[PDB]
Amino acid sequence: SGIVQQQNDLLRAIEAQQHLLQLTVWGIKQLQARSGGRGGWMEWDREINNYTSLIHSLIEESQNQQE
Amino acid sequence: SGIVQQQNDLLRAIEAQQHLLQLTVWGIKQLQARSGGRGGWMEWDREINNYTSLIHSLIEESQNQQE
């Protein structure tokens, strides 16, 4: 229906924003590397990795809702 | 319904992305502090704070839609 096409658009927006989010993460990592090893960012990295996995699962779930 | 479970998933995706967004903000702030006081970022901080409040209200509203 129309509420379905709408939900699909919202999902696509979220997917595109995730790409943008990953780009900003990458940008930040390159800036951090400029001062040396990123050892102090191990936890920050882990959190980013975890929330990214969470988002990926939600995106997967949203798409394979019905089929 | 199914369109409800779908909307819930989308909301969860948005909530997870907000966590990721806050992590990138924190990362940027630490990098800014590396060169000294963050006085020049007072306005940037304010804007970030305002949009974060806006998002928090929308997330709250979305969840307490019906009840």
Add this chain to the structure above:
Amino acid sequence: SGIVQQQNDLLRAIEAQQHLLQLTVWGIKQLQARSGGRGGWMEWDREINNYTSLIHSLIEESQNQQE
């Protein structure tokens, strides 16, 4: 309906998050400029620009769904 007000809230959340995303991009760019010309970020910039256009179109589409 209620599922419509809900979808509108989700869209507003996405729009607010896009503003936050642009703020983090701007923050990163200023940090990159601190070390000199941003020539090495031409591709990163292009990607960011492209995903931003993609998101803008999705937001436009979502809003002008029915009318």
